[PDB]
Amino acid sequence: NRPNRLIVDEAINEDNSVVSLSQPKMDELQLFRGDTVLLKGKKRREAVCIVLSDDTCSDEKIRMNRVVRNNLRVRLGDVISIQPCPDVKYGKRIHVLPIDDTVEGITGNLFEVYLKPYFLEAYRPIRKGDIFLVRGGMRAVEFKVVETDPSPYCIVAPDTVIHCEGEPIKREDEEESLNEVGYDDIGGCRKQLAQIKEMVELPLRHPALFKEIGVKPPRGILLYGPPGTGKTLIARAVA
Amino acid sequence: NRPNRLIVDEAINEDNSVVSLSQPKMDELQLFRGDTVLLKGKKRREAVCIVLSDDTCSDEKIRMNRVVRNNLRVRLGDVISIQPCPDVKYGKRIHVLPIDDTVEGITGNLFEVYLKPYFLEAYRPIRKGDIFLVRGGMRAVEFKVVETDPSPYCIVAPDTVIHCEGEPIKREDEEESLNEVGYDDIGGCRKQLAQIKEMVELPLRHPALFKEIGVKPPRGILLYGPPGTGKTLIARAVA
Ligand SMILES: Nc1ncnc2c1ncn2[C@@H]1O[C@H](COP(=O)(O)OP(=O)(O)O)[C@@H](O)[C@H]1O
Ligand SMILES: Nc1ncnc2c1ncn2[C@@H]1O[C@H](COP(=O)(O)OP(=O)(O)O)[C@@H](O)[C@H]1O
Numbered sequence: 001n002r003p004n005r006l007i008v009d010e011a012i013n014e015d016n017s018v019v020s021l022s023q024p025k026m027d028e029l030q031l032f033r034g035d036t037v038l039l040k041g042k043k044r045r046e047a048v049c050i051v052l053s054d055d056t057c058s059d060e061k062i063r064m065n066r067v068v069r070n071n072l073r074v075r076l077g078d079v080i081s082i083q084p085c086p087d088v089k090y091g092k093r094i095h096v097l098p099i100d101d102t103v104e105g106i107t108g109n110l111f112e113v114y115l116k117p118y119f120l121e122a123y124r125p126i127r128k129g130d131i132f133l134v135r136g137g138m139r140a141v142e143f144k145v146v147e148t149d150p151s152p153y154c155i156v157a158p159d160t161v162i163h164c165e166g167e168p169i170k171r172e173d174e175e176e177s178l179n180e181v182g183y184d185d186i187g188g189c190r191k192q193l194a195q196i197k198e199m200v201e202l203p204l205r206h207p208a209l210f211k212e213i214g215v216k217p218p219r220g221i222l223l224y225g226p227p228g229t230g231k232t233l234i235a236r237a238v239a
Numbered sequence: 240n241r242p243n244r245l246i247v248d249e250a251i252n253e254d255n256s257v258v259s260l261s262q263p264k265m266d267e268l269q270l271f272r273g274d275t276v277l278l279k280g281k282k283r284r285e286a287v288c289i290v291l292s293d294d295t296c297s298d299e300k301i302r303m304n305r306v307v308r309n310n311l312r313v314r315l316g317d318v319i320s321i322q323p324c325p326d327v328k329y330g331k332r333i334h335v336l337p338i339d340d341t342v343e344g345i346t347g348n349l350f351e352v353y354l355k356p357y358f359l360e361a362y363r364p365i366r367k368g369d370i371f372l373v374r375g376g377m378r379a380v381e382f383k384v385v386e387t388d389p390s391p392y393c394i395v396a397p398d399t400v401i402h403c404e405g406e407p408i409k410r411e412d413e414e415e416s417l418n419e420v421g422y423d424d425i426g427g428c429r430k431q432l433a434q435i436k437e438m439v440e441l442p443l444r445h446p447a448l449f450k451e452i453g454v455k456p457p458r459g460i461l462l463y464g465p466p467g468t469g470k471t472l473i474a475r476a477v478a
Binding site for chain 2: 140
């Protein structure tokens with residue numbers, strides 16, 4: 001049962017963090033316009049996002065973004081649990097610790113120039129254990145904290161200060177590189193990606209379905225197009 | 240800051256040693272028509288050149304010649320320091336010492352026939368540590384002194400005499416052969432060399448720019464043209 005699950009669907013808006021809901025959905029969770037949504041992944045982790053209310057763009061579909069796909073290990077064709085958090089929390093102390101994995105070629109203070117004139121009039125909520133990208137320096141670096149104030153109680157506020165230690169921590173292989181090519185990196189092909197989406201996720205996302213049924217699974221797929229259309233890119237993304 | 244640097248630009252005049260300036264440039268350095276310009280390279284070396292004043296040929300660009308490119312280890316896309324030297328010095332004693340590296344096939348006295356009827360009405364200034372070429376004998380030989388009067392105080396005057404010792408000095412590998420093919424050895428191709436000039440000096444003259452930006456650098460360049468147009472010559476020069 002549990003009439004509150006939302007199936008993951010493809011996103012069409014190239015925005016940062018906006019989730020579209022339906023008119024009946026506000027009355028079920030008594031959620032306001034701008035609230036803090038709490039999501040449960042696996043391995044005891046949580047994620048925070050920003051919900052948007054609209055009755056013109058979407059009808060009964062969610063718009064789940066890649067910024068939280070790797071933060072919950074949730075892919076296409078998976079269920080998730082939604083729960084409002086109307087509690088008011090204002091962060092005042094945060095911890096920052098860069099990892100010695102992608103700091104090559106970067107010198108000086110980068111926080112005071114990339115994080116200060118970007119978070120104003122945004123009020124973006126953050127949580128311990130989130131991987132977010134920034135647009136600066138003709139590239140995109142990541143961030144990950146390992147020890148900070150107990151979650152949540154993390155709100156970007158001007159009262160926070162900066163600090164440095166000089167002792168980086170060693171990264172682990174538990175998580176994957178979010179910088180790799182995804183489903184948001186292919187554009188201009190709606191009808192062509194749809195066929196791949198409706199033939200690849202059956203024998204891969206649900207392998208157990210095919211040992212029990214006698215239906216012939218597709219074994220070989222041929223790609224066409226002039227050189228450079230992105231045949232390799234699509235194959236890299238769908239895998 | 241330092242509003243006195245001059246960016247190295249391509250030269251169009253096939254002259255020997257002439258530098259073109261602008262009208263405001265004379266009033267900043269209070270330099271006369273014919274003066275002795277002092278240039279600072281690296282590894283504690285100096286160079287001397289002759290400046291020309293003109294307000295019709297160039298507007299705000301320098302014409303830096305290859306005769307002083309190898310004497311200061313300065314290439315395209317580099318900064319230099321300019322400084323006038325209004326001091327009057329007249330040389331009366333110079334030292335000459337040929338190196339046993341390119342004297343093969345040359346017999347007899349070559350100075351009295353190549354240097355005497357060439358420096359009259361020229362007043363070309365010279366300095367200890369300069370590599371200059373001469374036009375004589377269907378070739379071009381070089382010269383380099385290792386011990387002479389303290390720099391500068393070197394002016395070509397008729398009062399100087401000649402001398403010989405017979406003990407050549409061994410050359411070193413610190414400097415390169417100026418006789419190799421350069422940017423002044425290709426003519427008749429203005430638009431074609433411009434594209435190479437605006438695609439090769441980014442990832443070579445400034446390698447550190449590309450480890451920090453995500454811009455795709457050009458990896459392969461294809462050359463065209465009938466046999467003998469100089470495809471090898473251009474590649475040899477740009478490297
Ligand atoms: N539709 C597309 N969307 C985004 N990038 C594309 C697209 N088509 C081609 N590219 C770019 O082309 C690059 C290489 O082309 P690719 O598709 O990998 O080779 P091929 O076209 O032979 O499969 C990719 O890195 C990608 O950035
Ligand atoms: N534009 C040019 N300027 C000066 N020399 C040239 C030019 N084009 C051809 N040459 C002469 O042709 C010689 C050999 O031609 P090269 O270009 O090296 O062979 P290819 O044309 O097969 O690359 C060069 O050493 C050079 O003297």
